[PDB]
Design an enzyme around this catalytic site. Structure first.
Site, PDB file in Angstrom:
ATOM      1  N   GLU A 150       0.801  -1.213   0.000  1.00 21.45           N
ATOM      2  CA  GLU A 150       0.000   0.000   0.000  1.00 21.45           C
ATOM      3  C   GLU A 150       0.835   1.264   0.000  1.00 21.45           C
ATOM      4  O   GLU A 150       1.755   1.413   0.803  1.00 21.45           O
ATOM      5  CB  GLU A 150      -0.902   0.053   1.229  1.00 21.45           C
ATOM      6  CG  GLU A 150      -1.621   1.384   1.353  1.00 21.45           C
ATOM      7  CD  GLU A 150      -2.397   1.545   2.647  1.00 21.45           C
ATOM      8  OE1 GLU A 150      -3.221   2.479   2.705  1.00 21.45           O
ATOM      9  OE2 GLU A 150      -2.185   0.755   3.593  1.00 21.45           O
ATOM     10  N   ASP A 159      10.877   6.715  13.954  1.00 21.69           N
ATOM     11  CA  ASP A 159      10.879   8.101  13.488  1.00 21.69           C
ATOM     12  C   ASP A 159      11.388   9.011  14.606  1.00 21.69           C
ATOM     13  O   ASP A 159      10.781   9.082  15.663  1.00 21.69           O
ATOM     14  CB  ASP A 159       9.484   8.533  13.086  1.00 21.69           C
ATOM     15  CG  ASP A 159       9.445   9.959  12.629  1.00 21.69           C
ATOM     16  OD1 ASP A 159       9.949  10.833  13.370  1.00 21.69           O
ATOM     17  OD2 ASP A 159       8.913  10.224  11.534  1.00 21.69           O
ATOM     18  N   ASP A 178      12.164  12.799  15.843  1.00 18.88           N
ATOM     19  CA  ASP A 178      11.893  14.202  15.589  1.00 18.88           C
ATOM     20  C   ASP A 178      12.443  15.157  16.642  1.00 18.88           C
ATOM     21  O   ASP A 178      12.181  15.008  17.839  1.00 18.88           O
ATOM     22  CB  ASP A 178      10.376  14.397  15.493  1.00 18.88           C
ATOM     23  CG  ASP A 178      10.002  15.797  15.090  1.00 18.88           C
ATOM     24  OD1 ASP A 178      10.004  16.064  13.874  1.00 18.88           O
ATOM     25  OD2 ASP A 178       9.728  16.636  15.978  1.00 18.88           O
TER      26      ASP A 178
END
Ligand code: ZN
Lengths: 213, 389
Positions: free
Chosen positions: B44, B109, B111
């Protein structure tokens, strides 16, 4: 290993009786629970006098267990209560077991582990000792340690209660069992869920009212 | 580099998606070698188009679909998701409860805004050379565990395009991990308990798990320059009080003086160590960790259906390209010298093609991605050809 429902058939008396016998054993796990502590043989032998006396015996413990599922698969308090004592009992069953037969159930199981030689043992003793719980001491005792896939130790490593190295968890044999037990609690819980799920197709039966109440 | 003008984006993207996006390499990766049914066909992708419209269950048959479609839609954003039980775009065709997320790389992830309470250099969404060291430490602390602890061999680290990095663990065995395990891997790497605004956030116990130890070490190797020189964490009362807070109040006033009689942070830090050492007879390590240890968002890694920013996508604001980071020279990685979609389109302009990207500043970056790919091929060829024996 309480999987595969007993396909046998028993008198309404067998059923009716067994249930009460178990409701007692676990009720006894309730007694030997707050009156003692895991105080060796006292808590032990006392529990193992109930064990054999109350019947369970293997095929008896089997049926007994399942029949009680129909019982406690309704109230969560029950499911937590039932899974509770049912566990302390499974530990007990291990405790006694000798090193020889213990090793069988491990292997005969699926868990893929290995025992490490003093070779790697002392080399990693350092790490291992540091990974452990508040486990006082700086000695990796004599209790051998095993090398199992890090995933299989999920409940241990997610809390940094074990040493990972190259995707493997290095644990004491005390811990391998502790894993197998939570796997039990889990698998069982899935079962009580499924039973309650299809309980309706059994509520209406009259023979089953004493039990469900 | 020239300040980027996001107004040219529509045209730049068109160019970028028709001549620079490393398609063949992107495919080589996501297809993992044809060793699986429709591993690619069942992948996807998500897109963020025109007016910020958000399309989601996008799928493709082969590399050519991916190119055609992308070039027609010129996505502002492209996200990669899981591999499903059925082609994603035919989810209207699949029963209810039959359509499911089955496999997907473990991802992380990191940040900078997750550290706003430990940096004095910039403002929240920004980054400068003074705070980027944190990303350096994050990549090293996390990439060491994934490699030495978990035995994961294939880790693609990527620049987010503005103020952070992503990591894509691609081990064939990892793509099959249950959420429960991922959730566990994250907890194993997590250490800063960022509660509802609670001053102290790290607590060590007498015993120290090796992962924590090896982490402390890596940090040690950058603490002074980053924390004491660059961040100058102990420059004022308004700064050291912040650090004093993580220390038993019975020690405040003493240090408060030493700090007062000092001239710089490197000095004051040395006093902190000294004083704290007496008391102790871990307070030190806890402070380093609370200022330098990575903060991971469990959500990003837990979900097996999580859609994450695709490598080589373009950042709408900064314009920077999401490039693969080269681990063998992590410290050397510079966010500010990262090619702009504008910058690389210009290079291309100032010049089939199939090697166009190589004449651009993307070249080195796509090279890194290729080595990453070469190793996948190995492991694959290794396992199968040598173990299916
Ligand atoms: Zn900064």
């Amino acid at each position: 290993f309480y999987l595969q429902p007993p396909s046998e058939n028993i008198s309404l008396i067998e059923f009716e009786n067994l249930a009460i016998d178990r409701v007692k054993l676990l009720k006894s796990v309730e007694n030997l629970g707050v009156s003692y502590v895991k105080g060796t043989e006292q808590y032990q032998s006392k529990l193992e006098s109930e064990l054999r006396k109350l019947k369970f015996p293997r095929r008896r413990d089997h049926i007994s267990h399942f029949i009680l599922r129909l019982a406690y698969c309704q109230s969560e308090e029950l499911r937590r209560w039932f899974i509770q004592q049912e566990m302390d009992l499974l530990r007990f069953r291990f405790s006694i077991l000798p090193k020889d037969k213990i090793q069988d159930f491990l292997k005969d199981s699926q868990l893929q582990f290995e025992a490490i030689s003093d070779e790697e043992k002392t080399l990693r003793e350092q790490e291992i000792v540091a990974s452990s719980p508040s486990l006082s001491g700086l000695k990796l005792g004599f209790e051998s340690i095993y090398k199992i896939p890090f995933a299989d130790a999920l409940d241990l490593f997610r809390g940094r209660k074990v040493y990972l190295e190259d995707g493997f968890a290095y644990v004491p044999l005390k811990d391998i069992v502790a894993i197998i037990l939570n796997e039990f609690r889990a698998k069982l819980s899935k079962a009580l869920a499924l039973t309650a799920r299809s309980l309706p197709a059994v509520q209406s039966d009259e023979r089953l009212q004493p039990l469900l109440n | 580099m020239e300040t980027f003008d996001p107004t040219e984006l529509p045209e730049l993207l068109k160019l970028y998606y028709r001549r620079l996006f490393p398609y063949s390499q992107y495919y080589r990766w996501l297809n993992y070698g044809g060793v699986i049914k429709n591993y690619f066909q069942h992948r996807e992708f998500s897109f963020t188009l025109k007016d910020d419209i958000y399309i989601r269950y996008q799928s493709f048959n082969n590399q050519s679909d991916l190119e055609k479609e992308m070039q027609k839609m010129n996505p502002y954003k492209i996200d990669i998701g899981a591999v499903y039980s059925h082609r994603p775009n035919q989810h209207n065709t699949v029963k209810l409860g039959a359509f499911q997320a089955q496999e997907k790389e473990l991802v992380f992830d990191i940040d900078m805004t997750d550290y706003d309470d430990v940096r004095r250099c910039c403002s929240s969404a920004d980054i400068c050379p003074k705070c980027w060291t944190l990303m350096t430490m994050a990549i090293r602390i996390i990439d060491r565990a994934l490699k030495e602890d978990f035995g994961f061999k294939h880790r693609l680290w990527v620049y987010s395009g503005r103020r952070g990095v992503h990591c894509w663990v691609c081990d064939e065995s990892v793509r099959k991990l249950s959420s429960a395990v991922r959730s566990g891997i994250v907890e194993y790497l997590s250490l800063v308990k960022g509660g509802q605004d609670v001053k102290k956030k790290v607590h060590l116990s007498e015993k120290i798990h090796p992962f924590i130890r090896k982490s402390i070490n890596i940090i040690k190797k950058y603490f002074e320059e980053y924390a004491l020189v660059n961040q100058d964490i102990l420059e004022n009362k308004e700064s050291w009080d912040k650090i004093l807070a993580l220390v038993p109040e019975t020690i405040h006033d003493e240090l408060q003086q030493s700090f007062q009689k000092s001239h710089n942070s490197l000095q004051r830090w040395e006093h902190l160590k000294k004083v704290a050492s007496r008391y102790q007879n871990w307070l030190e390590w806890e402070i380093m960790l609370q200022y330098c240890f990575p903060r991971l968002d469990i959500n990003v890694s837990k979900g097996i259906n999580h859609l994450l920013k695709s490598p080589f996508s373009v950042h709408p604001k900064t314009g920077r390209i999401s490039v693969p980071i080269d681990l063998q020279k992590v410290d050397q990685f510079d966010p500010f010298t990262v090619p702009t979609i504008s910058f690389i389109c210009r290079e291309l302009d100032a010049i089939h093609r199939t090697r166009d990207y190589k004449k651009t500043s993307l070249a080195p970056y796509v090279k890194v991605f290729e080595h990453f790919l070469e190793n996948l091929d190995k492991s694959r060829k290794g396992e199968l050809l040598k173990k299916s024996d």
